[PDB]
């Protein structure tokens with residue numbers, strides 16, 4: 147085509163293309179190598195990606211995200227019923243299937259999860275087309291290893307709706323291993339552990355690979371643990387700080403909390419490469435500017451329990467795979483949250499100093515491997 151590889155993520159999506167023996171992770175119109183898996187509807191337009199996430203603060207009920215948590219599921223699934231209580235948008239039942247309901251151009255409309263995801267895939271397809279200067283049709287799309295047949299089918303359908311010919315649906319941890327060339331034949335079997343901490347989910351997968359064939363030996367994790375929870379801890383910290391300094395509580399002002407969360411998420415990224423970050427928000431609440439800062443040490447303390455807790459699923463995955471830590475040949479970091487130094491320290495310490503595969507931006511590793519596989523299948 148070339149054919150492309152797309153990581154359709156819970157919170158960010160990423161597209162890559164393999165050419166001249168190299169994977170190019172493609173930047174979008176705003177120069178971002180990943181794009182929010184968000185879609186929004188207004189009185190006059192449909193927004194996707196950066197454009198949609200940039201207005202979530204002002205249009206919460208018609209800005210959809212987390213479609214991946216509904217895709218391929220039944221409305222009566224316990225997971226769906228539980229998640230619905232936390233989303234600002236409406237989810238309705240259409241003959242046993244969930245649909246997100248929103249207002250668009252003044253009329254009520256509803257979309258199946260695969261239609262919402264097809265919008266995100268359309269954006270990734272267009273991002274690749276702008277870079278290649280050619281039409282893109284063929285693609286490999288990834289999914290969590292635990293997705294069942296229905297979830298895989300609905301994900302493939304999202305691609306087809308977007309005009310893609312989905313060559314294959316492959317597992318995220320497998321795509322990550324392929325990115326590092328761990329699929330090459332070296333003789334004996336090899337055990338690889340994928341530690342994937344994204345914006346909303348934490349996945350530990352142990353793969354055994356031999357003759358280029360992958361076997362998922364075990365999986366563990368938490369579908370409700372991710373970078374967004376670390377942002378939440380920072381938000382609560384700063385709401386308390388603003389209350390102490392101005393004797394005002396901003397908790398019930400949705401736009402204030404949103405601007406604070408956005409600044410916290412950005413400060414967090416800075417803390418993965420610097421030991422302090424500044425937060426400067428003009429007129430945060432009632433015209434009061436909020437200029438402050440946070441140290442990496444404080445950020446780690448605010449999240450100490452959540453960070454240390456990522457090791458339990460690692461131990462559980464090892465136990466279920468009937469493997470001792472010493473039998474893991476490679477550890478691969480995936481997910482933007484694995485860029486956090488304290489998480490890398492915890493994991494490396496747990497593995498007694500074993501080095502981590504982390505040269506490929508973790509938030510891009512899944513798309514990177516998908517792109518490689520798409521070229522192979524093409």
Ligand SMILES: Nc1ncnc2c1ncn2[C@@H]1O[C@H](COP(=O)(O)OP(=O)(O)O)[C@@H](O)[C@H]1O
Pocket residue numbers: 154155156157158159180343344345346347372373374411414415416418481482483484485486509510
């Ligand atoms: N440099 C960084 N340091 C800490 N967290 C990061 C960094 N870059 C990205 N993240 C986090 O990774 C998360 C989501 O991106 P990934 O790219 O993780 O997506 P997904 O959740 O869809 O798998 C977010 O919580 C984001 O803030």
Ligand SMILES: [Cl-]
Pocket residue numbers: 174175176195273
């Ligand atoms: Cl874009």
Ligand SMILES: [Cl-]
Pocket residue numbers: 491492
């Ligand atoms: Cl530590």
Ligand SMILES: [K+]
Pocket residue numbers: 153154155156157158159160344509
């Ligand atoms: K992603």
Ligand SMILES: [K+]
Pocket residue numbers: 342343344345347348349481
């Ligand atoms: K994940």
Ligand SMILES: [Mg+2]
Pocket residue numbers: 155156342344481512
């Ligand atoms: Mg991910």
